[PDB]
Each structure stands twice: as structure tokens, then as C-alpha cells.
Write a protein that binds this ligand. Sequence first.
Ligand SMILES: *[C@@H]1O[C@H](CO)[C@@H](O[C@@H]2O[C@H](CO)[C@@H](O)[C@H](O)[C@H]2NC(C)=O)[C@H](O)[C@H]1NC(C)=O
Ligand SMILES: *[C@@H]1O[C@H](CO)[C@@H](O)[C@H](O)[C@H]1NC(C)=O
Lengths: 56, 167
Amino acid sequence: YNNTNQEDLLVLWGIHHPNDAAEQTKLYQNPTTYISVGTSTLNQRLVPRIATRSKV
Amino acid sequence: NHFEKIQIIPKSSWSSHEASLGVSSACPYQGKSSFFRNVVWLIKKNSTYPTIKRSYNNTNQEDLLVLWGIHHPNDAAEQTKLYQNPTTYISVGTSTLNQRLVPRIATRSKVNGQSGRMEFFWTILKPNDAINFESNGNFIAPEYAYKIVKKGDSTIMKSELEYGNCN
Ligand SMILES: *[C@@H]1O[C@H](CO)[C@@H](O[C@@H]2O[C@H](CO)[C@@H](O)[C@H](O)[C@H]2NC(C)=O)[C@H](O)[C@H]1NC(C)=O
Ligand SMILES: *[C@@H]1O[C@H](CO)[C@@H](O)[C@H](O)[C@H]1NC(C)=O
């Protein structure tokens, strides 16, 4: 997306950290994933993180 | 103002990993070279290191200070020598924690004769919550943890002086 507007823009996004490899492939097939995001200033490569956690 | 130390993962309970070989000349007790007493330096048994999947639940009434660590070795040789598995990680989870630690190799100056490094981590595990570890190598597991028995005013004074038997 390009900010063709005149004012600063607050952009939000996210990453899913699943319970286990089963759920990872169940929902996305690909077993080893990442989200990379870039701007004139941002240089992010996010990587989902698996861990066994209490239900919330 | 007061911890009560409890055992939460007994040392004797590690069947498919060597638990008594996690020791170092950098930590002498009295000749016999030793280690941090409250955590275990787990190591490969037979030639191998099965994936560990262990968890403690805080059935107590008070917040619990849990400590654990990761081993960062000198090189791939030592990594496989001690844990066989060449690509490892420790993942730790709570109702709030979502950690995946990865050992980091780098060539470092000896300190207390060791070029490897140990990196410790911690959390406060609320009553009725559990901490779930999973690992594949380089894990330094908890044995003892601390119940926070009482809270109150205190401070960490910095002084070279000693106890004065006074009030
Ligand atoms: C830790 O152990 C206790 C059981 O000893 C669990 O207590 C249950 O937890 C649920 C959900 O938190 C509560 O709503 C219930 O009161 C408890 N159920 C029963 C049958 O006692 C607790 O869930 C465990 N904690 C975790 C994170 O697994
Ligand atoms: C060690 O490894 C071999 C498998 O390669 C196995 O057959 C042997 O019995 C193991 N030893 C013990 C004491 O478990």
C-alpha cells in the first residue's frame, strides 16, 4: 500500500503463534513461515514462534 | 522479604538425559568441579538427546520465581559432542510467556577458563498457572524455584561493610 493521502497513517498488522506444528500445517500448510514488512524506515522479518501455553 | 525455596522438577526424574554430568572447572566447589545448584545442566544420554517436554503447575498459593538457562557453545563440535542434535532451541510458555530461545555460536575470549556462555532467564509464574518447557539441546533446566512468601519494604543496599550485631 502506498500512502497517496496527505497525512500520516497508522498501520496495524499481526502474526499468529500456533500451539504446535500440527496446527501450523493445518491452517497454512507451509511448515516454516515468516512475515516481512518494509518502509523507507521499517525492516521487519517476523517469524512465528511455537510454544506450549496455558489456555486464555 | 522472604522466599521459600521448593523443588519443582526433581533432578532424579531425568530418565532419558544425563543429569549428573553437567559440571565445569569454572564452578569449583572443593576440588571436584561443580555447577549452579538450583538448575541442572542436562546432557546427552547414550549417544542421544530426545526432545524434552516437561511442565510444572503452580498448585501453591503464592507467586513463584522460576529460573532457567541456555548454553551457548564455542563451536559445532562442542554442540554435537554434548547434545548430538546440531540445530536446537528451548521453548517456554505460560499464560503470558511465549519464548523460543536458540543457542548462539560465536568465538569468545576465555572467562574463568571458558569460551562458552550461559544465559539465564526468569519469570513470575502466577498461582494456578503452569510453565511448559520443550527442548532439543542446550537446556539448563530448573530444579529449585522460589515461592514469594512475603512482600514488603526492602532495598538492596550497596555496602562493603559487614553485620554489626546491633539494632
Ligand atoms: C493447574 O492445575 C489445576 C488443577 O490442579 C488446574 O485447575 C483447573 O483450572 C481450570 C482452568 O484454569 C479452573 O477453571 C478449574 O478450577 C480447575 N479445574 C479443576 C478440575 O480443578 C489448572 O488449570 C492448571 N493450570 C494450567 C495452566 O494448566
Ligand atoms: C543405547 O543405544 C542402542 C541403540 O542404538 C540401544 O540398543 C542400547 O540398548 C542403548 N542402551 C541403553 C542402556 O539404553
